[PDB]
A = this chain, B = another copy of it.
Amino acid sequence: TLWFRDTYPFEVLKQRVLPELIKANGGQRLRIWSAACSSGQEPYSLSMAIDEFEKTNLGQLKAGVQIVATDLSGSMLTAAKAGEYDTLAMGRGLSPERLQRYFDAKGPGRWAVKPAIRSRVEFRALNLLDSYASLGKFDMVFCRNVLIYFSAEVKRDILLRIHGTLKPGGYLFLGASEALNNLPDHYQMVQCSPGIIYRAK
């Protein structure tokens, strides 16, 4: 994993998706699910992106954005919760501007997300083969580079149940080279130039 992986998912979030969802709900609270969050780079990247949007658009989001980040419980999810990273992890995909604006040095070779970035993310233990019903409803779901490991039938079952967590017209973000197969009545492919997102029908 790395920070702001592929660049354009987070630009699309700020430029395209957020203004559309805010216009419909009157700026009320939005919820984002970061599925298989690994060591936390993706959910914290989402948190920084929302912070950047909120600062440039005073004040379109009236209630903020909740990020729910999930993975299997253990030491990897535990470190994500701690929000600390070593130098090697911090040099992959993070501009120097974001490093100084959003992280605190500890600590020789240790950096931690700033409290405003940390507070948007709640980490929960969740197996993707289990039920998603405890997670609630989401305006956006990020499920990137995890579906690749499963069989075609299990991948379809996960995508179908992800659809049950999305509000209608919400968006699913997959990995850059991941296709969404055999659910033509559940997801609409949307071109972002660059990038592809999938609207929940």
Contacts and interface: CB of A to CB of B under 8 A. Distances in A.
A129 B108 contact: no
A150 B158 CA distance: 13
Contacts of A127: 72, 74, 76
A164 B3 CA distance: 15
A133 interface: yes
Interface in A124-142: 125-127, 129-137
Centre residue among A72, A94, A136 by max chain B CB count within 10 A: A72
Contact of A109 (B76, B91, B95, B105): B76
Interface stretch (A82-90, A169-177, A189-197): A82-90
A188 interface: no
Contact of A73 (B73, B92, B148, B164): B73
A175 to B, nearest CB: 14
Contacts of A130: 74, 76, 87, 91
Contacts of A129: 149
Question: Interface size bucket, A side?
Answer: 35 or more
Contact of A133 (B94, B110, B137): B94
A180 interface: no
A149 B164 CA distance: 21
A140 B94 CA distance: 20
A135 B65 CA distance: 30
Interface in A63-117: 72-79, 86-88, 90-100, 105, 108-110
Given A93-B131, A154-B149, A165-B96, A75 B137 contact: no
Nearest to A108: B75
Q: 5 nearest interchain CB pairs?
A: A75-B109, A75-B87, A99-B133, A73-B73, A96-B136
Interface of A: 72-79, 86-88, 90-100, 105, 108-110, 125-127, 129-137, 148-151, 154, 164-165
24 contacts: A72-B73, A73-B73, A73-B74, A73-B125, A74-B87, A74-B125, A74-B126, A75-B91, A76-B127, A78-B108, A79-B109, A91-B134, A92-B133, A93-B131, A94-B133, A95-B134, A96-B133, A96-B134, A96-B165, A99-B131, A99-B133, A105-B134, A148-B151, A150-B154
